[PDB]
Amino acid sequence: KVLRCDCTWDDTTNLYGTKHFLTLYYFLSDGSIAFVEKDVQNSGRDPFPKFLSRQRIAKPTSASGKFDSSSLGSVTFKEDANTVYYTAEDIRIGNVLNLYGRQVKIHDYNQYTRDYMAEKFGITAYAPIPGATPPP
Amino acid sequence: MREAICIHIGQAGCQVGNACWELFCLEHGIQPDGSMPSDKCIGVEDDAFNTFFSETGAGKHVPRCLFLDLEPTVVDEVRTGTYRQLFNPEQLVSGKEDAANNYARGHYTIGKEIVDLALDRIRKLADNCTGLQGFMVFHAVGGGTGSGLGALLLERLSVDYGKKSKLGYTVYPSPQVSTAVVEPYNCVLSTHSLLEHTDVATMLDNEAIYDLTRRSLDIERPSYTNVNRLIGQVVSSLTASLRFDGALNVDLTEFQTNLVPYPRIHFVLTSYAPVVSAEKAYHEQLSVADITNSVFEPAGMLTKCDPRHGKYMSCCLMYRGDVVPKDVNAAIATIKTKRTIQFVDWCPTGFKCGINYQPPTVVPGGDLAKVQRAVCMIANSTAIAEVFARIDHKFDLMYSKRAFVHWYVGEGMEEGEFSEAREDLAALEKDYEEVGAES
Amino acid sequence: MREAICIHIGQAGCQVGNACWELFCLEHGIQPDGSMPDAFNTFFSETGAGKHVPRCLFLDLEPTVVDEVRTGTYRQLFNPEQLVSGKEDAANNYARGHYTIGKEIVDLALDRIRKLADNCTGLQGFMVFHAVGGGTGSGLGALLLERLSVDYGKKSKLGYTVYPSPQVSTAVVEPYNCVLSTHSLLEHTDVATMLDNEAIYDLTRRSLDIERPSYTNVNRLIGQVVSSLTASLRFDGALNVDLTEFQTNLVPYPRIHFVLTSYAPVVSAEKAYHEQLSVADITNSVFEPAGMLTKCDPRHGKYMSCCLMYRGDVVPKDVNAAIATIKTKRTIQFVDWCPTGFKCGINYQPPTVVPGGDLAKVQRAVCMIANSTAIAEVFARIDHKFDLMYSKRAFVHWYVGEGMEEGEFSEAREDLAALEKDYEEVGAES
Amino acid sequence: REIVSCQAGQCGNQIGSKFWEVISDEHGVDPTGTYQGDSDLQLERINVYFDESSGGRYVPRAVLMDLEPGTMDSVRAGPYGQLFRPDNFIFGQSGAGNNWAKGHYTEGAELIDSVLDVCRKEAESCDCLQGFQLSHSLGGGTGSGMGTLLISKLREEYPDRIMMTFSVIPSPRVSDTVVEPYNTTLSVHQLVENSDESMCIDNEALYDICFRTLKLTTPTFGDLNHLVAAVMSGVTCCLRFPGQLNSDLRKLAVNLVPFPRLHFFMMGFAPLTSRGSQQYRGLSVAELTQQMFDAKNMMQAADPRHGRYLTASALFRGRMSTKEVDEQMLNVQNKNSSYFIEWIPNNIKSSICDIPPKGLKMSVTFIGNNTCIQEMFRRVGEQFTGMFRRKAFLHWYTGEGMDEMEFTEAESNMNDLVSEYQQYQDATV
Amino acid sequence: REIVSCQAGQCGNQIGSKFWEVISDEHGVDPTGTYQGDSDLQLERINVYFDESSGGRYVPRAVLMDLEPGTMDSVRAGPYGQLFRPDNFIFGQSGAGNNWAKGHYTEGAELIDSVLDVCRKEAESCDCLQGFQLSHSLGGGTGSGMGTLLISKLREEYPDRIMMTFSVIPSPRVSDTVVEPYNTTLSVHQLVENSDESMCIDNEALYDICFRTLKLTTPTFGDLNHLVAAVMSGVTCCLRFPGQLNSDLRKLAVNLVPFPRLHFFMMGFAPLTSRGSQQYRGLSVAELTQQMFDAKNMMQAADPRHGRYLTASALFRGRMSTKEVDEQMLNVQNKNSSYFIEWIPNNIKSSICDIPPKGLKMSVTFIGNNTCIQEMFRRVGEQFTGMFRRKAFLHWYTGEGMDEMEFTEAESNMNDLVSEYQQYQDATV
C-alpha cells in the first residue's frame, strides 16, 4: 500500500531554477517518503530515477524554513524520541512540505489516496490544484 | 539498463516460466493485461521492471521472455491462459511434434529446424536490451525437448553472443524419485552443454522441492504448481539485487565470479528459507539467524546434496527485507562455529552476502506465507559430486546392455556420443574430487 | 505544384491502382464521392464544384476490371474518361498487346495522358503500375512508355512492375512476356521497382499471421509502399524529397535502374501492441531479407544505394543511429565505390491504416528502395526460364503469327545478357 | 555596417530562419514587425540587419533562395516568416534534384539573375555595406551549386566587400544522401576563391554537442539551427553593440587569414550547458576559455589535437574584465604551444562586446583557422576518388552540361588546398 | 590549501555520501547548497571543500566513480545528493563484477580517461590545490582496482601534492566476499608506492565500536559511514578553521612518516559516547586522551597491544589549554614508554583547532603509524596464499588480461611491507 501524490517544487525564485515536477510515494509499511522526478521531453537533465530514497523525513523544527543538518550528519551521536516525522496526517492538497529546505507543494492525490483519506482521516473534500502534470 | 533475457525450454521450462512471470507481474504490479493500473500503486514507479519488462509507447509492459517448445499444448495453454494478453504473440515458439524424451530427436532432427527461429526471436529480444547481463534458461534435462533443444540453443547463444552471462536453471532428475526412463540418458548427454556452454548451472531437482513442501508447508500433496512457485521465488530472490536497491546490491557476474572457482566447477546448489506456511509463519520468530540456520542445515535446501558428505566452496546468500548488515555476519560467524558443515581449506572467506531492501511478495493462494524477510543460498560445494556419481551409475547400468540406444542412433546421433558423455561426466567427478582434496 | 500522374496498365495495374487510390482517399480524408466533409494537389485536382478527381489513367485492353471500377464504390470519384477500357484482352501475348490491339488504344491513351498533363502545371513525373508477365501490361505498357518517352522526353518515370516470381507464377508464356518487356523497361524507364508476388506472399504469411490473404492484401501492401514513397512530396517533413531527389541518389548508371523494395513495420494489431516499433528495430527488420517484396538475398550481392523514406514521429538522430548500426553490421555489404550509399527522407505524417485492412496502426514506418547487384539473380533465373522454352520454339508461333518478328526474341535475350553482364561488372571490385 | 544575408536551399533557409529568430530576440523585434525592445542599445544599431519601412516595420535584409518551392512555404509559415519581404522569396518551380550540375548550370542559372537583382537592390538600399553573408549546405543541390554561383556573381560585382559563407559540411555519420563527394568537391573549389571567410558546420559535430554537452534527449534540426545561429549572430555582435574592444567583419579575416588560400575556419561557442547542470556551473571567463578549446564544443567534426592553430579568435560578449579575456589566451598559448604554431606568437584575436546575448550572462564565439580542417577534406577527397574512379553517378551531372575534366580540376584543387594546410601543419622555422 | 576528493566504488561513494553531509553541516550548507551557518568563521575557509557557482551555491569538489549506475542513483537519491555537480557523476554501463582486473585494466581503464578530465578541471578551478583525498574499499573490485588506477595516474601528474587515501581494508569476521584477498592483495602493493598517506579502515572495528563504545542496538551502514566521516573531517580541521597550533596534510605526513614505505596509519576518533551516557560523562582532555589510546577506540580491527607505536598525531578540536594537551601526551609517553619506539623521542604530534564539531564541547582525531597494523596484512597474506596455492578464483582474473607472476609480485611486495614494519619493532639502540 503506497500513497501516491503529485507535487511541485518551484526553484524559479533562485537563479537558473525551474518548476520541478515530482511524484511522492508515502510507503505505509514503515511510513517512509520517496520521490520521483517526472521526466519531460527534451528536459536537458541527467536522468536519475530516484529524487529521494525511501526514508522518513523529520518535520522542520521551526517555521523559518531553515533545515537542521544536525540530524543527518553530526559527531554528536544523538537519537531523540522528539523527532516527529512526516506522517500521513500532513498529506493534503495544497500542503507545502518543507523537505530538506525545499518547499514542495502537493497538488493532486491518487484514487487510493482519496480512499485512504476518506476512510480514516475523514477528508471527503477533493479539489486538485492545477499545475502538477508536465506538458507532454 | 540491467536487462536479463528469460528463456524457457520444454514443458518444465514453460511451467516454471509461467510461475516466474506471474510472480514477477504481481511483484512489479503488472496486471495480466500487461498494463499497470493508474489508480493502484504498490510502490515506486521507477523503471525497475526494465530487467524483465519492456515498456511500449502505450504504457504496456511486455516480458523479455522466450517460451520455446517443440510441442504445442503448453504453448496453447499459455496462449489461452490468464496472461495471454501479457505474453507476446511471438517469443512463444511452438513446434509441431514433441521430442519425446529423446536428446537426439530434440538436438538433431527437430531441434535444428527450430533453432533458427529461436535465435531470431532471441536477437529480437536482445536488440531491445541495452545493458543485457545475460540469459536465464529454465529447462529440465530429463525431457527430450528441454535437453536437446536447450543444448542446441545454449551452443548457438555461446557462439553468437560470446561471453554474455548464461545461467541455466536445470531440473535434474533424481534417480531415486524420477518420472521418465530415458531421462538419465538425456541428462548425461546434456552434461556437455551444461558444462561448457552454461556459465552457471543451478540444480532444481524435483523431489527435494516435493518433500520440502510436504514437511514445511503443511501441504501433504505438493505438485508441479508448488514446485514452480518455489523455483520462481528463488529466481526472484536472486534477481531482486539488481531489480531493487539494497545494502549490498549484486549483479549477475558480480556473484558469478564469487560462485565459480574454476571454469568447469559451476554446478551449484540452491536453498530458500523461511519457506513456511501461514499457520507456522506467525508462530516462529523468523530472525535472520534462524533463517540462515534453516537455510544452511542440510535438509532445508532444494537439492539432494548433503553438505555432510562434502565440503563447501562458496556460498552466496541473498537476503531480502529489512535484514541488518550485522545480523548476516553474526549468522555467518555462528555458522563458522557450528561444525556440522565444513568448508574447503583454500577458501577461508567462503561467503558472499548481498542484502536487498525489497521483501518477497506472495501470490494469492500460494504455498508461501507473507514473510517480512527471507534468504536464498546459492552454494558451490564439493558434495555435488554424488548426484553425478549416481546419475552416471544409472547411465552405465542402462548403457551396458545398449537399451534405448536405437532411438538415439535413429534420430541422427552417433553411438560414440554416449561414451563421450560418460567420459565427460567421469572427468567432472574427478575434478570435483581434485578440487575437494585437501591441499 | 509537385503533382504526379498515376497510370495503371493491365489487370494487375488496375487492382494495384484501386488499392492505391482507396488508400489515398482515406489518407487525404476524401470520401468516395470525391468531396471532403493543398496537399492533395499531387493526386487529386479540385473542380469547380469542390469535388476532387484523381490524376490517374486506368488503361486496360479488357472490360472486366474497368467495369468493376465503374460499378464500384469509387465510381463517382473516378473520372468517366481516363478510365480506358478496350474490347478484347491481349491474352499474355506481348505481340498482341504491342503490335495489333495496342495501336488502336494507345492513341486515345496518349490523348488522356495529355489531358492530364496540360492540367498538371508542375508535373513531377509518371508512376506506371503494371505486371510484365501479362499481355496488356507487357505490350501496351511498353508501347505506352515508348510514346511517353518520345513525347515528354526526360520526364521522370517510376514503374512499379510485378515481375514473375521464381516459383509461384500463373502463366506459361509469362517468362516470354517478361523477357520481351525487359527491353522497354531498361531503355525507356527512369526507375523500375520489382514487386513479385511470392515475396509479398511469404512476407504476409510470416508477418501478418494470416493463413489466407490474397491479391487484395498484396495490393494494399503495394499501395502502402507507394504512399510511403510519395508522402515526402505530399506532406511536410524533416527531409522532403521529390522524385528526382531520390532518382539521382538511386541510379548510378543509365542501365542500372532496377531497384528492390521493402517496408516495415508491416504487422497485425495482435502483434503491434506488444512491440516497440523503434527506428532501429524497423530499420533492422527492413534490412532483413525476409522483410522485402522481392526475393533476392543481399548477402548474394553488393549493395549500391539504399534510399529510406521514414514516416511518422521518427527523428533524424535515431535515423542516423540506425544508419550507423546498419553500416557497422557485417552481414550486409556495400560496393566499394559507394561509401555513403544512403539517402534518407523523413516525413511527419504517420501512415494511415485502411478500415478492414491487415496493417496495424503504427506510429512510424519506413520504406527502403535498394539498387544492388544482389538482384541480378532474378534475371539469371528468368533468362534460363526463357531459354528453356525458346530452345525448341515453344509458344513462339503465337507471337510470330500475331505480327512480331522472330529475331526480337534473340534481341531481348541478348539485351538481358548485357543487363546481367553490366550488373556483374558494377559488382566487380575495383 | 549593414550586412546583407542570403539563404540557399532548405537547410540554409531553416538555418537563416533560426538566425533571424535569434536576431529578432536580441533586438526586441515583434514577429508582427514592430519594435518591442526595452533598451535603446538594441535600437541604436538595428539598421545593421534590419531596414525600416514607411510604417515603422523592420524587415530583415535577407534573400531567401531555393529551387524547391515547398520549404519556402514552411519558412514563411514559421513564427518569424511574416517578417521577411514577399519579393525576397525567390524560388523555382522545379527542385534541384540534389544535383550540383542542375543547380549551378541549368535551373539556378535561369534564376541567378532574378536573385541577383534583389541582392543588388538590397545592396543599393544599404548606404555602406559591411558585406554579404550566405548560409547553405555543400552536400545539397541548390544550397551548394547555385549558392556558389551566387557567391561568384557577388564577388564579381563587389570585390572589396566581405563574403561570409556558412557551409554545412556533410559527415559519414550523418551521410543522408549519396552525392556528398560530388556536390562538396564541386562547391569547395568555388568557395576557395569566391569567399573571404568560410565557416564549416558539421551535422555530426552538432549531434555530438547535443549528445554530450547540451544533453538533449531528442534534439532536432531546430536545435541544431539554434546552435549554429548563436554563433552566426555573435560573429557580428560588435557591429551592432558597443564594446570595450570593438571589431568589424573584416577584423576576423585580416587577423585570421595569413595567406589568401587559407580561409576555411574552425567553430565554437560558449557557454553550452544542459538545463539540469547549468545551475551548478559558475559562469566565468575561465570556464568560457576552457570550453572554447574543448574538442567536443567546436561544431565541426575534426579533432584539433591532430592539427595546429594557424590563428584563433574569441568574440567575447558581456561585461567582463580585460585581464582574463587575453590573459587566458596567453596562458593557453604558453601551455599548449605545441598545439599552436611557433612562428606566430599571439595566435589569438580578442574582441569584447558590452551587450551579452539575451538570456545569457556572458558568452563567447570561437572562430579559428586550424590545420585540422583538412581532415574533412581528406575524407571527402577519398570518397570522391572512390566514386569517380568507377564513373559512378556521373551521367546525372554530365547530362546537365558538365564535363569530365571539371571533376578532375575540382579534385586537383581540393588536393592543393589539402597540401597547403598539411605543409603548414608541419612547417619548420 | 583546498583539497579535492574522489569516491571510488560503492563503498567510496556511500562513504562520501555521508562525509559531505558532515562537512556541509560543519559549514552550514543545506542540500540546496545555500549557506545558512550561524557563525561567520565557518565560511572563511569554505573553499577548501566547496566551489562557488553562479547562483552562489557551494558545489563540492568531489569526483564520484563507479561502474554500477545503481550506487550513483542511490547517492543522488540521498538527502544531500543534489549538492554534487551532475557532470562529476561518471559511470559505466556494466559493473566491475567485483574483479580487480576488470576494475583496473579493461572497464576502469576505458573510463579513467574521462575521470582524469574531471580531476584536472577541479585542480585548475582550485586556487592552490594541496591534496587529493580518496575514499574506497580494497575488498571490492571497482573501489579497489579503479581507485588504485586513479591514484597511479594522479601521482604522475601531481607528484608534489598530498595523496591521501582512505581504504577500507576488510576483515575475516565481516568477510562478505571471496575474491576479497585477491582484490586487497592487488591493491596494497600499489597503495604502498603511489600514496603519501594511506589511512585504513576496518568494518569489523567499526562494528565493535558501534556495539560497545556506542551501545547502539542497530547501527547500520549509515552510522558506520558516520563514524568514519567524522574522523575523516577531523583530519582536515586546521585547513578549514583557525587554531592555536595549525597544521595540514603535509604537516601530519612529515611528522608521522619516518621512512617512505611506512605510511599506513590507523584512524581514531574521540569522544565517542553512548546515547544514555551523554549527561554523565565528563568531557575533559584526560578522558579524551584515555579514549584515544584505548584499544577499543581504534577503528581498525587490530589490537595495538601487540604492536608498538612508531609515531602518532592528535588533532584536537575545540578550545582548551595547551599544556593540558602537551604535558598530557608527555604523561602518556612516560607511563606508556613500552607503547612507543625508543629512538623517536616524543612520538606524539599535538595541534589544536579552536572550533569543535557542532554540538560538542571538545573533540579529537587520532592518527597512528603503529607497528601492529602489520597484523591485518599478515592475515590478508595468509588467506591470500591459502587461496592462491590451489589457484582458485584465478581464472576470472587471468582471462581478463592478468597473469600469475604479478600475483606473486603482489604477494612479495606485501611480505616486504610487513617485513619493513617488523624491522622497526624489535630494533635495539
Ligand SMILES: Nc1nc2c(ncn2[C@@H]2O[C@H](COP(=O)(O)OP(=O)(O)OP(=O)(O)O)[C@@H](O)[C@H]2O)c(=O)[nH]1
Ligand atoms: N520443476 C518442475 N519440473 C517439471 C515440471 N513439468 C515437468 N517437469 C520435469 O520434466 C521431466 C519429464 O520430462 P518431459 O515429460 O519430457 O517434459 P520436458 O522436460 O519439458 O520435455 P518434453 O516433454 O519433451 O518437452 C520430469 O522429470 C520433471 O522433472 C514442472 O512443472 N515443474
Ligand SMILES: Nc1nc2c(ncn2[C@@H]2O[C@H](COP(=O)(O)OP(=O)(O)OP(=O)(O)O)[C@@H](O)[C@H]2O)c(=O)[nH]1
Ligand atoms: N500483385 C498483384 N499481381 C497481380 C494482380 N492481378 C494480376 N497480377 C499479376 O498478373 C500476372 C498474370 O498476368 P495476366 O493474367 O495476363 O494479367 P495482366 O498482367 O493484367 O495481363 P492481361 O491478361 O492483359 O490482363 C500474375 O503473375 C500476377 O502477378 C493483383 O491484383 N496483384
Ligand SMILES: Nc1nc2c(ncn2[C@@H]2O[C@H](COP(=O)(O)OP(=O)(O)O)[C@@H](O)[C@H]2O)c(=O)[nH]1
Ligand atoms: N544544421 C542543419 N542541417 C540541415 C537542416 N536541414 C538539412 N540539413 C542538412 O542538409 C543536408 C541536405 O542538404 P539539402 O537541404 O537537401 O541541400 P539542397 O537540396 O541544395 O537544398 C543534409 O545532409 C542535412 O544534414 C537543418 O535544419 N539544420
Ligand SMILES: Nc1nc2c(ncn2[C@@H]2O[C@H](COP(=O)(O)OP(=O)(O)O)[C@@H](O)[C@H]2O)c(=O)[nH]1
Ligand atoms: N545502504 C548503505 N550501504 C553502505 C553505506 N555505506 C557503505 N555501505 C556498504 O558497506 C560496504 C562497505 O562498508 P564501509 O562503508 O566500508 O563501512 P564503514 O567503513 O564502517 O563505514 C560497501 O559494500 C557498501 O555497499 C550506506 O550509507 N548505505
Ligand SMILES: [Mg+2]
Ligand atoms: Mg514436452
Ligand SMILES: [Mg+2]
Ligand atoms: Mg487484362
Ligand SMILES: [Mg+2]
Ligand atoms: Mg573596433
